Structures are given as C-alpha cells and as structure tokens.
Design a protein around this ligand. Sequence first.
Ligand SMILES: Nc1ncnc2c1ncn2[C@@H]1O[C@H](COP(=O)(O)OP(=O)(O)OP(=O)(O)O)[C@@H](O)[C@H]1O
Ligand SMILES: Nc1ncnc2c1ncn2[C@@H]1O[C@H](COP(=O)(O)OP(=O)(O)OP(=O)(O)O)[C@@H](O)[C@H]1O
Ligand SMILES: [Ca+2]
Ligand SMILES: [Ca+2]
Lengths: 162, 161
Amino acid sequence: AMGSRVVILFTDIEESTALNERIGDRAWVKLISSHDKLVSDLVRRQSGHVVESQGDGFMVAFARPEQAVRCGIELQRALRRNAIRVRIGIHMGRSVRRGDGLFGRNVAMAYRVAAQAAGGEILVSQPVRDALSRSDGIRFDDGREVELKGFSGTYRLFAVLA
Amino acid sequence: GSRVVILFTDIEESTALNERIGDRAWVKLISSHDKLVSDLVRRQSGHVVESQGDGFMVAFARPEQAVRCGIELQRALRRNANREEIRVRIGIHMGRSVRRGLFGRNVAMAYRVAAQAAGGEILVSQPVRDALSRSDGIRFDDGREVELKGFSGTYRLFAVL
Ligand SMILES: Nc1ncnc2c1ncn2[C@@H]1O[C@H](COP(=O)(O)OP(=O)(O)OP(=O)(O)O)[C@@H](O)[C@H]1O
Ligand SMILES: Nc1ncnc2c1ncn2[C@@H]1O[C@H](COP(=O)(O)OP(=O)(O)OP(=O)(O)O)[C@@H](O)[C@H]1O
Ligand SMILES: [Ca+2]
Ligand SMILES: [Ca+2]
C-alpha cells in the first residue's frame, strides 16, 4: 500500500513491571529518564529518529538497515557497561506516515520481531538479514522459523552476533 | 506523582485485522476510531495522553468520568458493528503516577487490567469499583481474582455490567 520504505527499530525492556515494583516508582522514574537520554543520544549518532516513546521502550526510524543494527549494537554494549536488559527487533518495508508517526502491518511486524528477542539480544527480519549479507562487520546467526501473532505462515528471524 | 484515573484501550487482534483489510483501509479505520474515542473522552472532560499503536492511554480526574466514557465507547462500537468490525478491551485503574512531559507502576497496572479484559468488556481495579459502588448508571459483577504479570499476589478485577 502507500508509504515509503523505512527501517523500524523497536526496543522493549525485559520484565519492567517486576523491576518497577522492586525498586519503586521514584527509582524507576529516575532510571527510565536516564535510559531515555541514553537511547536518544545513540539514535542520533546513527541518524535515526525516535518516533514514539512507549512506557517500556521506543520505536525508532532509520533510512538504512546498517544504521539501525549498528545503533542496536552500540545500545546493547552501553547497557551491559552500566550493568536493565532490553530486547531489540529490527524490520524494514513500506510504512504509512501519519503525522510524525508510523502505521501499518510492518510496524506491527517490527515490534513482533522485538518481542521474540531475548534480553540483551538483537533480532532482525529476513529482509534486514538479506539487505545486510555482505556488510563488514555485521554478522548474523543461522536464523530460526517462528510463528508471529497476526501473521499467517512462519517467518525466519536472525540474531546479531558479537 | 499526583492522583489520577487511567483508562487504557486495546483493540483485539489488531494485527490480524491489519493484515486482512490492508494498510490503506487500516489507517482509515484507526483514524476514525481515534476520533470517536477522543470525542467521547472530551465529553467526559478526560484527556488523551498517549496513542501507543492500536490503543490509547487516557487520564481522568475522577473515576466516574472514566467508566461513563468506557460505557459510551463500548455502546458506540457496538452501534458501528451493527451498521469493519472492531472489538476493544478497556481497563481502568486509579492511583498516583509521575508526570513526565505518565509513568509508574499504576500506569502499568492500568494496562494490565485492560489486557485481562475480553473484547467489548470493561474491567476496573478494586479501588475504582469501591469509589463507584453506589454510582448511578453503573453496576459491577462480583469480580474475579487474577494473577498479573510483574505484580506479586493476586488482584480482584470487576466488570462493568
Ligand atoms: N498490547 C499492548 N499495547 C500497547 N502497549 C502495551 C501492550 N503491551 C504492553 N504495553 C506497554 O508496555 C508496558 C508493559 O510491558 P510488558 O507488557 O512488556 O511487560 P514487562 O513487564 O515489561 O515484561 P516483559 O516485557 O518481559 O513481558 C505496559 O505498561 C504498556 O504501556
Ligand atoms: N510490550 C509492549 N510495549 C509497547 N508496545 C506494545 C507492547 N506490546 C504490544 N505493543 C503495541 O501493540 C501493537 C499490537 O500489539 P498486540 O499484542 O495488541 O497485537 P494484537 O494483534 O492486537 O494482539 P491482541 O489481540 O492480543 O491484542 C504493536 O504494534 C505494538 O506497537
Ligand atoms: Ca517490556
Ligand atoms: Ca491489541
């Protein structure tokens, strides 16, 4: 349908509710605020754009898939340095721009991919894994077929290595 | 944070719906839905805080405003279904949440109530139920104990009849 091709990145903090209940709102608000600041800096460093700031994570838009992945790699490296565990999913395709937001099935797919990822892991769809086959120095695993809610059939998702 | 009533909406199987009608038709629907929700919220002096994908987070000062909004919304959706069909979950919780540019365990709690609700159903937390136990036009069931993700123990959620 309508829209231009874009790379969509979704973050998703693992077990944020349990963490919130554990440290309390005061400590939680301070933590997520610093987290928001961290993600914001890294996204800008890869020419990305934070589209929406959900309660647990963010939706981010990039022009190039390599920008999105590299942002993910740097984000995971920074979080481990501070050690919160975060899931990262990356998908690309056409998406409908409405206002300053993004809508469509590929937006849903993007989060779906992120939801399959483990804490501290970066997962990507096959189109992203294909667009980036021969790119130094980004390496993927062998992939795995998974069923995703709302979509028929199966989809192969790939994790970023190192 | 300050006291506030949080209402969450959540469309049932929106992804499958998106795939069935296509992005073009999908944007028409959610846009139309966005206006319907927003107008009813405003009528109850509520304010739409966020629109995370297929749902909305709404803040009310008083609990009766949130429930009355939920009832009118579910009545409106049913009226649209009889005349694409869309089922929506509604969860309502009240508690203190910090305002940043809303955040807090009570924001998460509010969503959790909505997620437990069936399509076309309105679920409310115990505090909301107690505040409106004798409200006009509002009646609740006997409620049911449930386990909520991230929260220890169990919580009793009441449905608006
Ligand atoms: N279906 C949904 N639609 C919109 N927002 C959601 C949805 N599910 C969760 N959220 C947002 O994310 C928050 C809850 O996070 P979530 O459901 O991811 O659980 P969590 O505690 O972080 O654990 P985990 O991610 O490990 O499952 C909610 O407060 C809500 O704001
Ligand atoms: N944990 C979460 N944090 C933030 N946003 C979420 C979360 N879970 C879901 N969402 C948002 O909700 C949208 C659809 O999610 P959802 O799981 O509600 O799909 P669905 O097809 O409506 O399934 P269901 O019928 O179970 O609601 C996604 O595109 C995403 O933007
Ligand atoms: Ca989460
Ligand atoms: Ca939904």
